[PDB]
Design a protein around this ligand. Structure first.
Ligand SMILES: NC(=O)c1ccc[n+]([C@@H]2O[C@H](COP(=O)([O-])OP(=O)(O)OC[C@H]3O[C@@H](n4cnc5c(N)ncnc54)[C@H](OP(=O)(O)O)[C@@H]3O)[C@@H](O)[C@H]2O)c1
Ligand SMILES: NC(=O)c1ccc[n+]([C@@H]2O[C@H](COP(=O)([O-])OP(=O)(O)OC[C@H]3O[C@@H](n4cnc5c(N)ncnc54)[C@H](OP(=O)(O)O)[C@@H]3O)[C@@H](O)[C@H]2O)c1
Lengths: 485, 485
């Protein structure tokens, strides 16, 4: 029943236009926001709410029946022009917020839809000029959080000198995805997954992020950070933590994040011996973008060695996981779009089926086509006695046909309104993540190894499969699945 | 490549006509029998193969393209008339078999499609007169194997004084069913089912046999043995053994049956305190047979107290199962046809989900609609965080749409040709089974308790649910499943 103000810093930018304004509209439309909520845009351009509406409403997918809700939404919107390090401008923004209904008392949520080069100036000026003295104040920050241990150190130190940890909401948007959030319930609400979730039963864990398209003419931005910073140090490592963590003392946000940091503290720095890097080249037999390699993007520097693919093996050196390889595999221009967690279990001990069994697997497919299934052995159906691979399956598209699955940003923004930090990256989480990868990132920067070429649309360099086999992953190619429609 | 003779003793009877002759035809038609196979019928009636063909071919479901195979099948058939305790008649049968192609050398398989009142005379005369001196000799016996410990003792003793255990094939036809045979592969080929298959994780095991029809005007036969002898002492107890047994030293038939007997040797005699008996009565709101109770069958004696429903709790007193109730529940005129194995797992320890979780369950549905599924907890799909019940599923009708699942008698008869006794009841198995149930059966006979009435089409007496709750089964009614078509 308190007033809430949602401040979109960088309201003129593309992320605000296509993602943040549509998301806050969808939450508003669905009745999920506090009744007394206002939206304030802030950016350099001299805009009006009319301009904000013209630019973003095409992405709202509004229906004719939503006309009244839409009018109320934009009546609750306003816009303040100003520079990002100009004190007087933030004084104008603060006075503007105070003048809203109960604006002095309101809770204030600042979304930094801005490039990281202005994070320090924006957070400094918000702290100096725009904090509520009565309501809470929360800041939402998106990546990049630095480029390595040192650069993340400095950003984190600046922000923490101003804001308490319970005011900082760092987005990793995979933490907003349906099946990523499900990892904790699958693991800790089920006896069928409890006593087997350990090194005595698990031979290897595979965390996968694949996209079938290349850089799409935007490689110049990607070239400055590469695939490990892009997808592995954040999304894949987050999935690792949720797969590996001990059971938390409760589902309180910091009991959960405590257990995630504890996992990271038992991972040593990755070394090049456990790393395979690739860069995609064009497929002469392909069509369209598939004929073009990474270096065929004219925004990519000539002779770039930036990796578009990486397979990395990590180890969690604790009692539950000692010696179990965690394989993190990701890349662009591969054969499919897929984000997935896979457990491969050890062979059954004391084989009585004359070497016909294959290792069980548990698969949590995050996207597309959200699903959980366990590959297991069944008696070959019919007049046969030999075991054959089959699966127990849960596919959301068929089990939950009419259930809307919210976008990650819908879920995460709502969490900030509700004060739940469970699905946001804590300061110490971030530090450990950079600790694990910075020696490798510095060696790549220093020595500039040439990545292994792989053809657009392939599974990546075969050396990645060899690395996975070396550490204990077994692939047979015997499993046959066809959709029961 | 040896000659094989399949002798149907009782070839004129209904079981031979509708089941045994059609089954041996189906195996023949499918190329599964040895090339040099002959079928010999033996019964009292003075019949010809023409008569055998006229009576049984309607149950063959032959196609026009099978005409030549059918003609060869009946060319390989012959019939010998004779009495079941007449030495000269068995001498005629033996000479008839000798006169077949390599008949002196042939393997001989005797199927006793006969009432149990002639078992002793038939086996005695087969042993005296019709055994091959070169090939093997195997006898297939169907239930009843006695009515209690004493009466089974005498039959077993008679048969074992004549035949070695590796010549005796006692049918429990549930051992021929697809999903019953799968129990051993599911349990022992999968790490995901290994470390949880014990008293630390399992709260109760439920073994269910339900039919939705009553005695259908044939209650007079049923009345002499009742539901425990009919379905529980055999089919359900066999499913118990396969669920409970330790891992066998190999899949050799007697290593497997060793482990099944070992289970039974740790089950104490069941006492009335762990037993609920019911008898169905008519449903006045029903239609057809549903309006008629057990006593409304005019072939049932007036005032019969025979139970048509039983729920019994057994305990396997060993390290794996100590204290885990095994609930055996079966009956006629219930709400569905179903044969099923269910494991209900213990609550997860150290609840962090505020009492929202439900116990996991593993279900192996033997019939109809063969399936395996695990009821488990998933995050409620959508913008919710609470756990909700769902399932991982394998349904044969959708996963294996075009795979023929053979009838139990097809599978079991073929096993006799192949010499596999794994799915047949050993002598010591039978003895333990009768040991467990005979004190209860004698008390029922002596005291004649009146069974609890239950209406046709219901789930049975509510006292059965109370018994299941008392020993630890939990039912919430919260699980909702709808078919993903
Ligand atoms: N509910 C459902 O939708 C459902 C259920 C069951 C199965 N399926 C589908 O059935 C198909 C097969 O299932 P699956 O992928 O889980 O089992 P799979 O084909 O046996 O593959 C298991 C793993 O081995 C990897 N792989 C493939 N070739 C390899 C190689 N030469 N060396 C090393 N690793 C290799 C695969 O990598 P990649 O990640 O690159 O493929 C995959 O991660 C999939 O398309 C799956 O989506 C769907
Ligand atoms: N692949 C598939 O076909 C598939 C997969 C999943 C679910 N389903 C179907 O979904 C429906 C529900 O699944 P489910 O039966 O496994 O779970 P459930 O409805 O939660 O029932 C679990 C057990 O509780 C018993 N029960 C019902 N009422 C009871 C009561 N008052 N007291 C004590 N026990 C009671 C049931 O006995 P009964 O044996 O008499 O029912 C059943 O064995 C079923 O019809 C199932 O066939 C099908």
């Amino acid at each position: 029943s308190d007033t809430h103000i949602f401040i979109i810093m960088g309201a003129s930018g593309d992320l605000a236009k296509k993602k943040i304004y549509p998301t806050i509209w969808w939450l508003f439309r669905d009745g999920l926001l506090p009744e007394n909520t206002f939206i304030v845009g802030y950016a350099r351009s001299r805009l009006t709410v009319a301009d904000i509406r013209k630019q973003s409403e095409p992405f709202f997918k509004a229906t004719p029946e939503e006309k009244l809700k839409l009018e109320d939404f934009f009546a609750r919107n306003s816009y303040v022009a100003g520079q990002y390090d100009d004190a007087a401008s933030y004084q104008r923004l603060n006075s503007h917020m105070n003048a809203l209904h109960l604006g002095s008392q309101a809770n204030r949520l600042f979304y930094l839809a801005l490039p990281p080069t202005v994070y320090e100036a924006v957070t400094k000026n918000i702290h100096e000029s725009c904090m509520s003295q009565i309501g809470w104040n929360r800041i939402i920050v998106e990546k990049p959080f630095g480029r390595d241990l040192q650069s993340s150190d400095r950003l984190s130190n600046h922000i923490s000198s101003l804001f308490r940890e319970d005011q900082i909401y760092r987005i990793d948007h995979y933490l907003g995805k349906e099946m990523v959030q499900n990892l904790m319930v699958l693991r800790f609400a089920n006896r069928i997954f409890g006593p087997i979730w350990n090194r005595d039963n698990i031979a290897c864990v595979i965390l996968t992020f694949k996209e079938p398209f290349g850089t799409e003419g935007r490689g110049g931005y990607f070239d400055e950070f590469g695939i490990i910073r892009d997808v592995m140090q954040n999304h894949l490592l987050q999935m690792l933590c949720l797969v590996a963590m001990e059971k938390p003392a409760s589902t309180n946000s910091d009991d959960v994040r405590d257990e995630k940091v504890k996992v990271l503290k038992c991972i040593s720095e990755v070394q090049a011996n456990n790393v395979v890097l690739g860069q995609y080249v064009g497929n002469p037999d392909g069509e369209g973008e598939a004929t073009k390699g990474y270096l065929d993007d004219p925004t990519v520097p000539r002779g770039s060695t930036t990796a578009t693919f990486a397979a990395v093996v990590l180890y969690v050196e604790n009692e539950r996981w000692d010696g179990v390889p965690f394989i993190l595999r990701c890349g662009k221009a591969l054969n499919e779009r897929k984000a997935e967690v896979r457990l491969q279990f050890h062979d059954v001990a004391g084989d009585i089926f004359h070497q016909q069994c294959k290792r069980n697997e548990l698969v949590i497919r995050v996207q597309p086509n959200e699903a959980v299934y366990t590959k297991m052995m069944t008696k070959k159906p019919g007049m046969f006695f030999n075991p054959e691979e089959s699966e127990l399956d849960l596919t959301y598209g068929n089990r939950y046909k009419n259930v809307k699955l919210p976008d990650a940003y819908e879920r995460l923004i709502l969490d900030v309104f509700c004060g739940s930090q469970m699905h946001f990256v804590r300061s110490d989480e971030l530090l450990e993540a950079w600790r694990i990868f910075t020696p490798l990132l510095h060696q790549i920067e220093l020595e500039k190894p040439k990545p292994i070429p792989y053809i657009y649309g392939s599974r990546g360099p075969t050396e990645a499969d060899e690395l996975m086999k070396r550490v204990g992953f077994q692939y047979e190619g015997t499993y046959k699945w066809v959709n029961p429609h």
